[PDB]
């Protein structure tokens, strides 16, 4: 009981219009004239897109707080167990910076969410050691970082799940090492859908076992699209599981996000797909749905 | 002819304005509308995945004439900076590009190699041997098709000075029955990475090294990355240089790193190697040093 979702009740044409809805009236609160990007804009050198730029006020890391690096990136805090830092794919010159932050901060799980190449397009940049190479790859910027294949942990890949997991080590010369997990989920293209509702599952199960001391970092290209569906299938989910889903959730928890990192949740097909895993969560079937969507 | 005020202002004047100096220098170019398409390419030959080599200055490829082509690749720039020696600043080359690196030296001719970086330091490997390291005979071939070998002078052994951390390495590249290339390596130890030499006197000597070297063909430097103590060593020559033909001015330490930049992206990474150069040329006007 407790959890309200009436959504379920609607006709297919009715939660196909909903959506479209819902989604166009977010874009039409858009409004980024009256709101500050002071760094972000200042480091358009680091920007992988020159007008997807992080909100000031919730810039990370400087609003745990002189951090003398930058990643196009914010924290999203929705008042759950778990923070993230929604961010963009670091462009070469950004790594060391990306790489410093996961260090200085402990970052204990990195989420990725896209390939590196789509469609005969980059949306990002490696940063973790080829599986073929020697198992460590280094920078130079920022005083230097070493990154490393874990040797007592190897590379995991989950076929049906098109997930990846890397199990990393970073390090700085004279200073302790840093163990985390990076989880590269290549199953689901920009501009589509995920080609199964268990690999996101699977995501959220990552997210949920790591520690709540530390924000989850989550990554697309621009960091505003499957890197916003992914955090608000999970704060959707959250309220699922305590009890406090409402008919408006959904909306809400985008609403929230986009208050924190301008234009989360970038296209309807990715709004879509939150109220998509409520309703495997719940047993519903997607299957009609899906169908129109493609 | 020497104009430099620097001289002329306070502790906290000078400190001030290479901080900003510098600053500026750091956002001058965008890589966004710079090609390292070639480096990209060699992703495997290069020791750093942030170290990129411009590809407008890409050595030896800058030097093709139409339609000729290089075979091979160094993470490496030339940089012109309209004095008497040219260099090429290059990163300390990797295992998969050492055969590249020697080929380089040898097919260019170059008379004179700087290594301003130690194999290792602190645990981390900062750089790959390329010369022989045997009882003073040392005769190694080279990976590759070529037939490149590489020797120890049989005439000439390696010099240690241990006063300076310098140690010199006269080297020989030889390929099939072609006529055999000689040139000098020469090793400086007293300078960790991302800092500043532990004597000035180390560093003139390597200037020195530089001076008297032919001017018929670029000067290779290179540390671990090619970027940091490579620059500041590049920077250094060339103020000095003014400072020698008295054309020295107030902006030319400035001029002389966005110059740099222009022509390998990153040339002097830390402020502080930015500030050797204004150092080093202060200290060799007999001013004293603050330091910090």
């Given at each position: 009981d407790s959890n309200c979702?009436?959504?379920?009740?609607?006709?297919?044409?009715?939660?196909?219009?909903?959506?479209?809805?819902?989604?166009?009236?977010l874009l039409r609160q858009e409004d980024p004239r009256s709101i500050s990007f002071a760094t972000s804009l200042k480091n358009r050198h680091k920007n992988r897109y020159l007008d997807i730029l992080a909100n000031e006020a919730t810039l990370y890391p400087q609003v745990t707080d002189s951090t003398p690096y930058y990643i196009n990136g914010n924290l999203i805090?929705?008042?759950?167990?778990?923070?993230?830092?929604?961010?963009?794919?670091?462009v070469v010159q950004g790594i060391p910076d990306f790489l410093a932050m996961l260090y200085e901060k402990k970052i204990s799980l990195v989420i990725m969410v896209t390939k590196l190449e789509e469609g005969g397009f980059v949306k990002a940049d490696r940063?973790?050691?080829?599986?073929?190479?020697?198992?460590?790859?280094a920078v130079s910027g920022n005083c230097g970082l070493t990154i490393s294949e874990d040797p007592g942990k190897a590379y995991e890949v989950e076929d049906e799940l098109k997930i990846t997991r890397r199990?990393?080590?970073?390090?700085?010369?004279?200073?302790?090492?840093?163990?985390?997990?990076?989880?590269?989920?290549?199953?689901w293209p920009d501009h589509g859908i995920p080609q199964s509702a268990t690999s996101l599952e699977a995501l959220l199960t990552n997210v949920?076992?790591?520690?709540?001391?530390?924000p989850v970092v989550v990554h697309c290209s621009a960091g505003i699209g499957r890197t916003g569906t992914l955090i608000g299938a999970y704060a959707a989910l959250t309220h699922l599981e305590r009890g406090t889903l409402t008919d408006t959730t959904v909306y809400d928890?985008?609403?929230?996000?986009?208050?924190?990192?301008?234009?989360?949740?970038?296209?309807?097909?990715?709004?879509?797909?939150?109220?998509?895993?409520?309703?495997?969560?719940?047993?519903?079937?997607?299957?009609?749905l899906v169908g129109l969507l493609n």
């Open positions: 979702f009436p959504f379920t009740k609607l006709s297919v044409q009715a939660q196909y219009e909903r959506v479209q809805r819902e989604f166009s009236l805090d929705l008042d759950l167990p778990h923070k993230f830092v929604a961010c963009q794919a670091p940063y973790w050691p080829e599986e073929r190479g020697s198992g460590s790859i199990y990393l080590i970073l390090q700085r010369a004279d200073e302790p090492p840093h163990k985390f997990t990076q989880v590269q989920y290549t199953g949920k076992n790591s520690p709540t001391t530390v928890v985008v609403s929230a996000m986009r208050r924190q990192r301008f234009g989360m949740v970038q296209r309807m097909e990715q709004y879509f797909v939150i109220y998509l895993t409520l309703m495997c969560r719940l047993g519903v079937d997607i299957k009609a």
